Amino acid sequence: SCMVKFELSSSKWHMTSPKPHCVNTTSDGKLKILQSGTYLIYGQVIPVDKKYIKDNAPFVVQIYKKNDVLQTLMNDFQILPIGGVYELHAGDNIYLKFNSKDHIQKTNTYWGIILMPDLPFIS
Amino acid sequence: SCMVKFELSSSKWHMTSPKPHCVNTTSDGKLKILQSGTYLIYGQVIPVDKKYIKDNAPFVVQIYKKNDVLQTLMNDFQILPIGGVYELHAGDNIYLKFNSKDHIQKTNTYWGIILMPDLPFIS
């Protein structure tokens, strides 16, 4: 059972155990994957209200795995759920990149991962 | 330990156990919470290429809890991760409504839930 949750407001991780077996975390909100497996990356990025962003810079969020883009997301400054099921390997780094971090409202913005268990049953 | 994933191409649920204690799933892709707790609702909704769009409806995806919309998402027909962390109660029906079923590439489109453990360990 391995899961972590980073709240950007406080810059703290919350975790299943004191020293999780599956991941290491950093206080800038990056993770390193210690256990290869199927992971669910999740989170919600809250944009600053668009009336307050006075140029034409798009609201963009990317999740990286090492130096590869796992996904690129953009909407018109509306709340953005992120992530999905990804196959990760020991040693992989996961981190988010923002078009501009001034777009991001720290309060209630969060992200993390959960090591998924196998799902061998089907109906 | 309780997780389910619905694959829209096959209309099958993939599950941690033969009869998950935490949730009831049905073959229309809906589900019902059996165990009160913190849940991570997740998924990715993949739109077809814009050149196949027949109708004039915008790309909108909603998650309902019982009869009220819980989450409303929309973009310019791009990949759409859904969900986030929500407190749900025994009895809550969770399901998805799309603006137009034709908008969806069933192949890589999935959603489901995981009952979340507590994350008591901080920093």
Curated annotation (Swiss-Prot), chains A, B:
GO molecular function terms listed in the Swiss-Prot or TrEMBL record: cytokine activity; identical protein binding; tumor necrosis factor receptor binding; tumor necrosis factor receptor superfamily binding
Subunit-level organization = Homotrimer. Homodimer.
Tissue expression remark: Detected in immature and mature dendritic cells and in macrophages (at protein level). Detected in spleen, lung, heart, thymus, monocytes, macrophages, B-cells and dendritic cells.
Q: Which family does it belong to?
A: Belongs to the tumor necrosis factor family.
- Any idea which UniProt keywords this protein has? Adaptive immunity, Cell membrane, Cytokine, Disulfide bond, Glycoprotein, Immunity, Membrane, Signal-anchor, Transmembrane, Transmembrane helix
Name the glycosylated positions.
Answer: 24
The question of whether Thylakoid is a record keyword is answered with no
- Organism of derivation: Mus musculus
Instruction: Output this protein's name.
Output: Tumor necrosis factor ligand superfamily member 18
Query: What is one GO biological process annotated to this record?
Result: negative regulation of T-helper 17 cell lineage commitment
- Give the top-rank taxon of the lineage listed in the UniProt record for this protein: Eukaryota
Q: What does this protein do?
A: Cytokine that binds to TNFRSF18/AITR/GITR. Regulates T-cell responses. Can function as costimulator and lower the threshold for T-cell activation and T-cell proliferation. Important for interactions between activated T-lymphocytes and endothelial cells. Mediates activation of NF-kappa-B. Triggers increased phosphorylation of STAT1 and up-regulates expression of VCAM1 and ICAM1. Promotes leukocyte adhesion to endothelial cells. Regulates migration of monocytes from the splenic reservoir to sites of inflammation.
